[PDB]
Design an enzyme around this catalytic site. Structure first.
Site, PDB file in Angstrom:
ATOM      1  CG  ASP A  59      52.207  29.188  44.082  1.00 37.17           C
ATOM      2  OD1 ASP A  59      51.060  28.694  44.092  1.00 37.17           O
ATOM      3  OD2 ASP A  59      52.925  29.096  45.112  1.00 37.17           O
TER       4      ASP A  59
ATOM      5  CB  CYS B 198      41.015  33.558  42.333  1.00 37.37           C
ATOM      6  SG  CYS B 198      40.815  34.811  41.239  1.00 37.37           S
TER       7      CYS B 198
ATOM      8  NE  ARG C 181      45.153  32.221  39.874  1.00 38.67           N
ATOM      9  CZ  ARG C 181      45.790  31.634  40.863  1.00 38.67           C
ATOM     10  NH1 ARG C 181      45.180  30.711  41.597  1.00 38.67           N
ATOM     11  NH2 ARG C 181      47.042  31.957  41.128  1.00 38.67           N
ATOM     12  CB  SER C 182      37.084  35.082  38.909  1.00 37.78           C
ATOM     13  OG  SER C 182      37.528  34.508  40.136  1.00 37.78           O
TER      14      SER C 182
ATOM     15  CD  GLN D 114      44.445  39.972  39.834  1.00 39.07           C
ATOM     16  OE1 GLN D 114      44.889  40.523  40.829  1.00 39.07           O
ATOM     17  NE2 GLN D 114      44.309  38.640  39.744  1.00 39.07           N
TER      18      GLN D 114
END
Ligand SMILES: [Mg+2]
EC number: 3.1.3.48
Length: 280
Positions: A180, A214, A220-221, A261
């Site tokens: 998370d 995502c 994450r992509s 990010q």
């Protein structure tokens, strides 16, 4: 090497200045159509939008917007579609894209609920018996099979175009264990997952581009594509030590904003390419 450029960044404790450098150098291009007031509710985030030059259009006269960009990596002979997690109103658009772009795999790198909020719609059927139908785009989606594991799940899915009766096998590669908060302690499961996607042929050019997401389709992509591409380029080039991650990231950013990010995800990407480079 990057092994030793990496160790320099740790010791110098300088990850967020590196990452901020990438931000400033990064491409900015217009996103005129993302921002038309009629596509408001086709976007999860007011500040994640596809560039016009690289956006995917839906093949339909009504409204051709979806929040999805085509990342085209010339040299590695790899292409990806990064996109946001489907909203309840955009699940049909999402499968239309999969249908029209002739994609073989969907790679999903979020749980449907994270940190107690919904990060994505349940855009695919959970039970063989209860199939989905997208009336707006005349598609049927059926769960054929499902294989669940420590760090990921794969699904065989059938996508019928109801207009034309043709059907197609889509592979759903769900990475279920990204935390998370922050990033994985080690990149080993993630690499493992990447190889499994690779193994399916879903990245291969006999098919249209894999659709990776995502919730926003950049964090994450980004890592997934950047790691995949950097390793391919390490496999291909006369001098493997020559692949610059920062350079490759900035190239990818010409096609979609925001890829990676956080400085953590960046460290993590470096990390996963180095560890991934020893399976070679
Ligand atoms: Mg059952």
């Amino acid at each position: 090497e990057m092994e030793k450029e990496f160790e320099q960044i740790d010791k110098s404790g300088s990850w967020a200045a590196i990452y901020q450098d990438i931000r400033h150098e990064a491409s900015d291009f217009p996103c005129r159509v993302a921002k038309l007031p009629k596509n408001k509710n086709r976007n999860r985030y007011r500040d994640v939008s596809p560039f016009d030059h690289s956006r995917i259009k839906l093949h339909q006269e009504d409204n051709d917007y979806i929040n999805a960009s085509l990342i085209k990596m010339e040299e590695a002979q790899r292409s990806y579609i990064l996109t946001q997690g489907p909203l309840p109103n955009t699940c049909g658009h999402f499968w239309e894209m999969v249908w029209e772009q002739k994609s073989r795999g969907v790679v999903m790198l979020n749980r449907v609920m994270e940190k107690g909020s919904l990060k994505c719609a349940q855009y695919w059927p959970q039970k063989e018996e209860k199939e989905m139908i997208f009336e707006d785009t005349n598609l049927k989606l059926t769960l054929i099979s499902e294989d669940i594991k420590s760090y990921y799940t794969v699904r065989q899915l059938e996508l019928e175009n109801l207009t034309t009766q043709e059907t197609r096998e889509i592979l759903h590669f769900h990475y279920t264990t990204w935390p998370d908060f922050g990033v994985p302690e080690s990149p080993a499961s993630f690499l493992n997952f990447l190889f499994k996607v690779r193994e399916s042929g879903s990245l291969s050019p006999e098919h249209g581009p894999v659709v990776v997401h995502c919730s926003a389709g950049i964090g994450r992509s980004g890592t997934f594509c950047l790691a995949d591409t950097c390793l391919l380029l390490m496999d291909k080039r006369k001098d493997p030590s020559s692949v610059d991650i920062k350079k490759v990231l900035l190239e990818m950013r010409k096609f979609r904003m925001g890829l990676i990010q956080t400085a953590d995800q960046l460290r993590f990407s470096y990390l996963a390419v180095i560890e991934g480079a020893k399976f070679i």
